[PDB]
């Protein structure tokens, strides 16, 4: 779900979800098109296509479990939807985690109209 | 919120 989500960000990263990653670029908590401005905007890009993968799963809502092995995330099994959603999410994480060095505050609240164009997943 | 040890 998008909270467990949001709580996955922050255990991983040390930033909050909500402002930190949920209006960031063309892609972080609202994407669609656009060129993908820096690393961190093309995890959420990743994490869109990841979840559109999924068409019949509801990521927002449905909730997966997991825990940690010494850092790792580990997916614990749920249904289907449950295993592909968390596997989603899993990757952001780390891919935000791997990216923060890039990570870029004038990105926040970024303006929709310098998002243009399609880029296939 | 979600530990384990450290």
Redesign the interface.
């Known amino acids: 779900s998008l909270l467990e989500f949001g709580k996955m960000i922050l255990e991983e990263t040390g930033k909050l979800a909500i402002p930190s990653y949920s209006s960031y670029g063309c892609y972080c908590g609202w994407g669609g098109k656009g060129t993908p401005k820096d690393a961190t905007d093309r995890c959420c890009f990743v994490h869109d296509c990841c979840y559109g993968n999924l068409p019949d799963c509801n990521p927002k809502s449905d909730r997966y479990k997991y825990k940690r092995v010494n850092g790792a995330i580990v997916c614990e099994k749920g249904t289907s939807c449950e295993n592909r959603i968390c596997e989603c999410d899993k990757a952001a994480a780390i891919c935000f985690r791997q990216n923060l060095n890039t990570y870029s505050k004038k990105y926040m609240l970024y303006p929709d109209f310098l998002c243009k164009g399609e880029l296939k997943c | ?2 530990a ?2 450290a």
Do not use: E, I, P
């Open positions: 919120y979600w384990a040890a």
